[model samples]
Target chain A: NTDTLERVTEIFKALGDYNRIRIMELLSVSEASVGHISHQLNLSQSNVSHQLKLLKSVHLVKAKRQGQSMIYSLDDIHVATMLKQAIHHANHPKE
Target chain B: NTDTLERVTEIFKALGDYNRIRIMELLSVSEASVGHISHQLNLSQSNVSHQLKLLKSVHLVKAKRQGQSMIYSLDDIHVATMLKQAIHHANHPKE
Candidate 1:
């Protein structure tokens, strides 16, 4: 079945947006709460929370309760690895 | 500068399409030319050639001279690793 391909497309599709990709990258490096993600990225907490929801929709990210907050991290190392690799691949000014 | 971010966005943007993603996976595993890629993926040589151009534009894939054809491979190990990781990440039936 093409279901696998469909899901893969969704992963790249969801990742294509800049803000969402940035959110994923931030989480890729370390776990964070909505407030931290918002402040660290200079975005509103509301919007950061919204972006987290979308990221979670595809299982790209996961959250767990810590104290009074839900801290989010990438769902797996694969996600983190891809984020890192893509960033490195983009290091060239132009080639 | 967000130059890196912009370039990374282009990478994910170029990767968002299903056929292009398939082509990437194909090249990820092994290098091939437009003729082989077209036949392997059941697409026209013309279409495959066009996709290769787009892939190269973002440096996601690279091409080289080989005999009567151009041999194309991924630009780096990063791309291959990302392709493998993303495919693995999407393996869950539903989660």
Candidate 2:
């Protein structure tokens, strides 16, 4: 069970950054090249690439080559669902 | 949108640790006193209490007085759903 918990926690750890969350939000709707993400999010291109690598490490996002650029998107439907559930939970009013 | 992203990231940060995830899983199934959690998880009572405090800070878990002991449980159905979705995603097979 601890093994399972550890694996799950890794995904949460990956999602625990502001830039990464923003990138995921963007990617959830559409795949984007590193340049596009950097410009749209106002983050440096290097920062965007670094965060994308981190997201890919956890399998939260994946990258594919598109011409000269790498396009990034949510790795799986499950990741989008997990993010949606987390956002919904975070916004839920306390009773 | 950034404010919303930051708040949601805080929830993921809270769920990022192995011990915390273990506690969340245990509490998801049933509320438990600190002593009971310590005994069951083979962790120090102080450690269990400390993690519970961290969880409370993020509103992931809530505590209530029950006789001489305090009981800890997941704060809301939304938190449960978030954890469930994360776990499901973690176990999902790659395509």
Candidate 3:
């Protein structure tokens, strides 16, 4: 069954964590290697890799092999757009 | 400071739970009293109340006093819009 509610819950679940959410946000702007993401977030490479794996499992992020490294990017542009809409909604509400 | 990212994390965190999410979705369509939500979700009043409190903490859902009951509904329509955008993003991608 293609239930949007369940799927939306999964999307939010993927973003529930501080680390994973941060990684997703950073990747939304630019594709980054695990090392780059780790450095920016001040987390260990292994930790970043672990979180990326989880994110990838949910298809919130995708990785591509780049020589000795893997570059990750936001797997769903819809997430970015949804986030933007959320921002608009937060800033401007029914008055 | 107004940071959409942190706020987004909070929103997603609020939706991370299966129970809380179900409650939010249930309330999205109509204003539901705590008893109604608990019955629909097959959860206890206390459990539902706890989840509703968390959702309320993040403003994902709101509760209003109605007689001796507390009626709940989606706090921000933006969350609904974002969820819709997320569904659209998942189904279609740049080709």
Candidate 4:
């Protein structure tokens, strides 16, 4: 009945890293190429690529080859929504 | 702004374990003592307590002393909602 929750934890683990969470937050608003993500985060392309691999593994991101660059975007709304809702709920806890 | 997303990762890491997720799912329906959790999962009281401590660390489950027993239940609706939403989102992906 609750096997699906395992997937949620997977998403959480995937996003546990500082760079990975920053990548997700940046991509949440719009899709970005690896180079763009690297520039925004002030990290090397190799590092961004490594983190993107983890995000893609968890289905938190989608990547496609566009010539030499890979575009990454949030592929899972549930993850994005959960991130949004968790923030919202924590900030607006019931009294 | 994105610092809160880091907290989401912490919760995810906390619940990443099989036993911990099981505890959250069980407690979602109703609060239960450590013994009750052990009985349901067929695990030892120490194992259950160990996992519950992790869940409590992340604020996913709340524990209270009632006589000699400790009761634990879902403490974060945001977490519960995220699990529910992620399940819903995964099963019903858009076209």
Question: Which of 1 and 3 is ahead in TM-score?
Answer: 1
Give the true-structure RMSD of model 1: 3.0
DockQ scores for all the models shown? 0.79, 0.68, 0.46, 0.47
Candidate 1 CAPRI grade: medium
Runs of candidate 2 exceeding 4 Å displacement? A1-3, A42-51, A64-71, B1-3, B42-47, B65-69
The pairs that clash in candidate 4 are none
The digit string of per-residue lDDT tens for model 2 on A26-81 reads 77888878677666778577886676676567666666877887666665676677
Q: Over the stretch B1-95, how does candidate 3's per-residue lDDT look in tens digits?
A: 33766675665565565655555556666777867765786757888777667656656566678688666666566766765566675566567
Whole-model lDDT for model 4 versus the true structure? 0.65
Task: Please report how far candidate 1 places residue A75 from its true position, in Å.
Answer: 2.0
Put the candidates in DockQ order, highest first. Answer: 1, 2, 4, 3
Candidate 4 C-alpha error for residue A5, in Å: 7.3
How high is the lDDT of residue A3 in model 3? 76
Q: How would the docking of model 3 be graded?
A: acceptable
| Maximum-lDDT candidate | 1
- The residue-level lDDT of candidate 2 at A89 comes to 65
Worst 10 contiguous positions by lDDT, candidate 3 chain A: A16-25
Arranged by lDDT, best first: 1, 2, 4, 3
Q: Per-residue alpha-carbon lDDT of model 1 for B1-95, expressed as tens digits?
A: 68877777777667666766666667666777677766677757887777667766766667788788777776656666676777787776655
TM-score attained by chain A of model 3:
0.78
Residue pairs that clash (backbone atoms under 3 angstroms), model 1: none
Clashes of each: 0, 0, 0, 0
User: What's each prediction's TM-score?
Assistant: 0.82, 0.75, 0.63, 0.71
